[PDB]
Amino acid sequence: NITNLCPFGEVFNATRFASVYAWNRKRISNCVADYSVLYNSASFSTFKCYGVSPTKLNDLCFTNVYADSFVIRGDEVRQIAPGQTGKIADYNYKLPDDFTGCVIAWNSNNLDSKVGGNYNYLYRLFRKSNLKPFERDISTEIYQAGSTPCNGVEGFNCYFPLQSYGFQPTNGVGYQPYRVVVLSFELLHAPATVCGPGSHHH
Amino acid sequence: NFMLTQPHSVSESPGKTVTISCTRSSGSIASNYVQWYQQRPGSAPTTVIYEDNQRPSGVPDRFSGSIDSSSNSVSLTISGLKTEDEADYYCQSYDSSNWVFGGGTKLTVLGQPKAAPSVTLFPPSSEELQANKATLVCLISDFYPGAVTVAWKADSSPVKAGVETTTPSKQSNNKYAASSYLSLTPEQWKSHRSYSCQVTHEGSTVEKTVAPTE
Amino acid sequence: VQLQESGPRLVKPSETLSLTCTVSGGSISGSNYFWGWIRQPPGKGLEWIGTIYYGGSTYYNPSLKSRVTISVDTSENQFSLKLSSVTAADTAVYYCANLAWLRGYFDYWGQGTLVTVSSAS
Ligand SMILES: *[C@@H]1O[C@H](CO)[C@@H](O[C@@H]2O[C@H](CO)[C@@H](O)[C@H](O)[C@H]2NC(C)=O)[C@H](O)[C@H]1NC(C)=O
Q: Could you tell me which residue ranges the BetaCoV S1-CTD domain spans (chain A)?
């Protein structure tokens, strides 16, 4: 009673990726998921499934599967993992300590880096408190780092929260853009609709 | 484009806990999974830990793997050490194009029971005497450490010309063994009363003697 | 109950080498595994040679991409290995192992076969 394939291509092959701070999440349900297209490709620089068997994915049915897509630089990819610290994990995108899914990343220097510097991509540098897991904040209010209130970015202790990347093709690999896709596996007391090819409900 | 570094050797007592680190020389070790393999003397390797912490069903839960984020390395921990675990261990990882193994680690269990070896001396067959040759075989086995010095004689006097000996290696019993030979001709084999194969291990000596007819 | 190596052990130096790894109990046409080659000199460490997925995608060791090619045929359900212009350092015990779906750990190993490069008739 289910034959359509899950549109993983609409996320990985998407023309543009949303900024990391405003990470874009897509819900996936009512389809047959062929994960072997993902966990066998050699183009991915980082492929780590946390909490699940990465090879036995084609045998599992799930209630819903969520795919989050964004881009960061190379040295910040290590922050996309359960139990991590840093500007991306604390303020931009936080995974829970019991994250059940896969973390996928690959270099995109030939896509997201324009000649001279790509400032379209941004990321949060200052925030009041650390982000609870899977919290998506977009407030661009002036961050107050001192005892004096702020109205406008001028004056010390008043900064614009979002920081833009300087992605150029000449930048070092550690400072090059890396498209990241995070798969979240959710199972509830509900009809499991995201199954692998050789699943049990079939 | 990267490598994996392992320590030269480790050693611990039975029932104890040992740790082996797998250091990456280039790139983040957390990029992909790192695995571990146990290769016993002679036989083929076998996966003990995969996915940096996972054991396949059939591997004792005494093995475990963890991560060291700062040192850019993972570690394999073996609690409750047993003499059967005395083997070589390798770590393997994949970085976007290549499967790369580590250097290796020689695990040695302290205390395996030390003892004296066992010696056996054969009389040469008659068909070899009719083949312009003569050989006295001396087999050594079941001793630790795998260090042994051999000596041969002829009519109580030192005669050791034409002797073949292989350095000791580990046998299928997690113990050591070796073999020594003696090259002779048919005429000089029966011309002497008897020959000897003296075996010294940690100062303890044991010899055997064979005769042409007796 | 799956893998076992071939029997052309002796190889003359400066010539080529060929080994085959037969897979019993399982269709290699059922491409759900990678198939790799691993060698090790006597008393040395393991070195990866190359893997092959039946989809055609091959991966070779960069130190051996000039001399190593790996094929596979479903007519007899086995994958081969070519090591051209052999040298003295290539004396090793060549294992063929099965690799699971993901590029992770080798599941099913063989028992290897020792090849030696020297000159005696
Ligand atoms: C993204 O685009 C690539 C490139 O077109 C797709 O890869 C193709 O996949 C089909 C079906 O498996 C093959 O017939 C083509 O030969 C592939 N092309 C290349 C260049 O590899 C890919 O399937 C798309 N989707 C994802 C998720 O990567």
A: 4-197
